[PDB]
Design a protein around this ligand. Structure first.
Ligand code: MG
Ligand code: MG
Ligand code: MG
Ligand code: MG
Ligand code: MG
Ligand code: MG
Ligand code: ZN
Lengths: 140, 38, 131, 134
RNA sequence: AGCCAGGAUGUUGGCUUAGAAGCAGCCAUCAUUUAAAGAAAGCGUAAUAGCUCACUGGUCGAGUCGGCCUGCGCGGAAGAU
């Protein structure tokens, strides 16, 4: 009901209802279950889940922290930073909407001699500003 | 620089100086703190 | 409390231990880090040598009325004096050693038998043996 | 010249040792198994601080020191973690004979030879860790 | 005030954190040798590293710092023949 994104992790319990003998169809209860579902959704605390992807960037060591700073600018959390003899490897989980076009930004910070990898990891609740952003655009 | 009526030190490195009857704030650390009473 | 009253206390304490001292060895301390001075300070505790850096004006005032007065000639520059609570004539040997081995400070003077001994003729204190 | 805190029986991982003294030219493997060789005698799982000493020709020596007090204080106290915040909750009570045992363990590190003074320094450090003494 | 040096030891205080190692934050903040030493008043590092400061000894050799009241001034202050 909020935007059009698919609802996930929802448990429904049909405790009570009403049925007319001659006017009760499959579609009548479908419309009835849909009215009730929409009404409950608004009363409940409905939030978006963004996807977060595991990110492993490999960078030269002289410009390590700048990479980390940009990662913190892309609303990402950090789970470690290995420092090999060939270059530093930083691990992260960045939301996909903030992972758009990272390669040109990552190349600008590093003289273009860095590289990275993205793998989808999990879903997680978005902050209020980005949730408010995806609702105005989808709604209108 | 900041040409304004109220000039003051904005950090510990800002110094107040008078050079032609004009109160100036010069800072050796932050060039943003350059002010002039005008 | 009062810095003058702290001086009244520091002067009275550094001269009271000069009462029981046996041989005073004064030296320079500038140019050396902290833990390097504690290599000597542990060496003074085991030999019973009291080591305390006090000001040059304070030192003269304290040692007035004491056999170590002749040392007013050497109380200029940074001053590191050593007293000999026990084992008389032992500070000197330790001092000379550390000086010529790794630092730039020298042994300003010594003070045994209540007379001043110049820097190069202090091997006399080294020759005197612990008894 | 570099200082590390390495596990008693393991110098295998690259990130802790590789970058810090690789630039110095320390032969990783050499220090690894020399370090382990001498730290064999340490109890299992005691993190021990080592001061590595390199010279212009990339060759090196090192000194091993006594484990960090906080690591060594939480083991005697039998507390796996650390006090969340002092002045409110104390996770246990450290013993007095253990403080002097700890004092003679890190005898070389302490500048005071009074031994009792060593205990006070260790006790003061423990107090900041939220423990109380009997 | 300036200049010459130190600015220690436990240690990277304990948590939190990917890292928090004087210097993101919370909770502390106290022992050590001391001349003196903030579990740092700042800069800096992704974290380290690094640079100062507080605090001290020397040199120097005479006044020097912070407020209160008050007199006269300064800036604020750009218009049309
Ligand atoms: Mg921590
Ligand atoms: Mg801290
Ligand atoms: Mg910092
Ligand atoms: Mg006035
Ligand atoms: Mg006016
Ligand atoms: Mg005016
Ligand atoms: Zn400024």
């Amino acid at each position: 009901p909020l935007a059009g994104y698919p609802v996930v992790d929802m448990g429904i319990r049909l405790h009570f209802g009403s049925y007319h003998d001659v006017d009760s169809s499959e579609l009548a209860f479908k419309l009835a279950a849909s009215i009730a579902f929409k009404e409950g959704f608004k009363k409940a605390k409905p939030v978006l889940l963004e996807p977060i992807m595991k990110v492993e960037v490999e960078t030269p060591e002289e410009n390590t922290g700048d990479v980390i700073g940009d990662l913190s600018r892309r609303r990402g959390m950090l789970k470690g930073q290995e420092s090999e003899v060939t270059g530093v490897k930083i691990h992260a989980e960045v939301p996909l909407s903030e992972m758009f076009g990272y390669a040109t930004q990552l190349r600008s910070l590093t003289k273009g001699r860095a590289s990275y990898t993205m793998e989808f990891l999990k879903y997680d609740e978005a902050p209020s500003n980005v949730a408010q952003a995806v609702i105005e655009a989808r709604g209108k | 620089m900041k040409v304004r009526a109220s000039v003051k030190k904005l950090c510990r490195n800002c110094k107040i100086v008078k050079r032609d009857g004009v109160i100036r704030v010069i800072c050796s650390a932050e060039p943003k703190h350059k002010q002039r009473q005008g | 409390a009062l810095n003058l009253q702290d001086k009244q206390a520091i002067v009275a304490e550094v001269s009271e231990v000069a009462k029981g001292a046996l041989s005073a060895v004064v030296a320079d301390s500038r140019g050396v880090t902290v833990d390097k001075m504690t290599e000597l300070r542990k060496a003074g505790r085991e030999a019973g040598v009291y080591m305390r850096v006090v000001r040059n004006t304070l030192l003269r005032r304290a040692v007035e009325g004491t056999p170590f007065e002749c040392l007013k000639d050497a109380f200029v520059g940074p001053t590191l004096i050593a007293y000999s609570m026990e084992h008389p004539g032992a500070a000197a040997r330790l001092f000379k050693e550390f000086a010529k081995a790794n630092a730039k400070f020298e042994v300003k003077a010594a003070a045994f038998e209540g007379e001043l001994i110049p820097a190069s003729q202090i091997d006399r204190l080294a020759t005197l043996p612990t008894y | 010249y570099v200082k590390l805190q390495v596990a008693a029986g393991m110098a295998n991982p690259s990130p802790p040792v590789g970058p810090a003294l690789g630039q110095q030219g320390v032969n990783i493997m050499e220090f690894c198994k020399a370090f382990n060789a001498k730290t064999d005698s340490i109890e299992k799982g005691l993190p021990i601080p080592v001061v590595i000493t390199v010279y212009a020709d990339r060759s090196f020596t090192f000194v091993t020191k006594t484990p960090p007090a906080a690591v060594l204080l939480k083991k005697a106290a039998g507390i796996k973690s650390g006090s969340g915040k002092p002045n409110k909750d104390k996770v246990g009570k450290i013993s007095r004979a253990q403080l002097q045992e700890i004092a003679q363990t890190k005898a070389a590190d302490m500048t005071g030879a009074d031994i009792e003074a060593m205990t006070r320094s260790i006790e003061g450090t423990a107090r900041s860790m939220g423990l109380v003494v009997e």
